[PDB]
Amino acid sequence: PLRDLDSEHVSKIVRLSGIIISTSVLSSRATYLSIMCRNCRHTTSITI
Amino acid sequence: PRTLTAQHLNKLVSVEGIVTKTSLVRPKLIRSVHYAAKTGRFHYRDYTDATTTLTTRIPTPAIYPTEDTEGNKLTTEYGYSTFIDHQRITVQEMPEMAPAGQLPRSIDVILDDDLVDKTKPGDRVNVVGVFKSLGAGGMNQIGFKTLILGNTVYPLHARSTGVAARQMLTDFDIRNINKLSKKKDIFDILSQSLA
Ligand SMILES: [Zn+2]
Known part of the structure; x- marks a missing residue:
């Protein structure tokens, strides 16, 4: 149950039941980034 | 080089003197081409x-490209670049x-492209160009860096020197030179006029 959560269960897998009351709007997060340096013009990439 | 002072900076000047040393002609890279x-x-x-435009610009320090806008590796095409x-x-x-x-005074002249191999050490010369101050004289942290950006380089001839003397011949001059020949005492007239 939701009230039976303690310090033991931290970085561990739990199974929970309940009711949903909120759902926010979808946000954008990056997965692949391409960048450039504003002074010398060096280019590289990033993967998340 | 002795009477050239700090009140003549940023003006066009003529300088007389002797060439004492020349450096090796080196290529300079302007545009580089690549292949993917x-x-x-x-x-x-x-x-x-900074030594190609007479007015100050905002620096652009671009870098040498080895990589494409996606990451593809590029081969360098030495024959297609410009130097x-x-x-x-x-x-x-x-x-x-x-x-x-008394110890002598000297001045540095920078030459590029076509004016690059006109003289040799030990020559009488006259140079015209802009007397430029460069960089920052330690105010970011002796004084300023001064040199002439050459535009004109004239060789001059003097007694006991390795630069020869030649004159431009006018057609009028040629006519007298050729007229004198026919008279059959050329040797005597030219010989008696020698000192
Ligand atoms: Zn940079």
């Missing part, structure tokens, strides 16, 4: 420095105009 085998496309870039030549020379006051028993 994964897209079959060629890319280029431009480079510049322009460079040389530096030093000038000093002539020994027969300088004060005796």
